[PDB]
Structures are given as C-alpha cells and as structure tokens.
Amino acid sequence: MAPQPKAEPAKPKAPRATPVRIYTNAEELVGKPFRDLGEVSGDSCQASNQDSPPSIPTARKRMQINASKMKANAVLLHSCEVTSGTPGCYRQAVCIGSALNITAK
C-alpha cells in the first residue's frame, strides 16, 4: 500500500487601499484617534478658459494630492470656495481643509 498526503496551497492577496480620504465631518476627526499635521489648500486658477476648468472636485483633488504629499490620509474639508472676477484669475476654485492622519494603530 501507499499513503496519500496533501498540502493546501496559499495564494498571496493583492490589496490596494486608498491613502487620503475626504472628510466633511469634523465630528469624525474629533471622535477618532488621529494625528494633526496642518491645513492644506487646493486651488485651481484660470488665467483664461484656455486652461482646464476649475471644478470643485478638481480643486478638491489638488488639495487631496497636496495633503497626501504631506503624509496626510484625511482632509477635513472646510470650504470649497470658487472665487471669480479676479483680474488674472478669472475663475479660481480654492478648496481648503485640514490635512490630518489617522493613528488607529
């Protein structure tokens, strides 16, 4: 006779978590273990319509990238103010929010 062994093969997982989250809820930050860094802004000005449109999500993404490059993972969005009529910056969308990190470990 001859016995029959076996071995369960394991396959490595491939996760892809998102770094920075947008948070319009200060309640969340106050109610969570987080590390304060500094307020970051994302502004997209248009000298002319030749540029790329100053959408709120556009300025928000600029702010998000600025936050992430500041080692932040959460942006406490406060005001997404699009200012218009400014000479030189016909339409400048400025989204301002605090760049924080979450210390949940």
Technique used to solve these coordinates: NMR
Task: Collect all residues with Cβ–Cβ distance below 8 Å to 38 and sequence separation of at least 6.
Answer: 70, 98, 99
CB 99 within 8 A of CB 37: yes
> What structural domains does the chain harbor?
1-105 (3.30.110.70)
Nearest residue to 84 (alpha-carbon basis) of 46, 56, 52:
46
Helix/strand/coil for 80:
strand
Nearest residue to 36 (alpha-carbon basis) of 76, 85, 83:
76
CA angle 29, 66, 93 (to 5 degrees): 95
d(CA 21, CA 4): 51
Q: What b-and-e string marks burial along 65-103, b requiring 16 or more CB atoms within 10 Å of the CB?
A: ebbbebebbbbbbeebeeeeeeeebbbbbbbbbbbbbbe
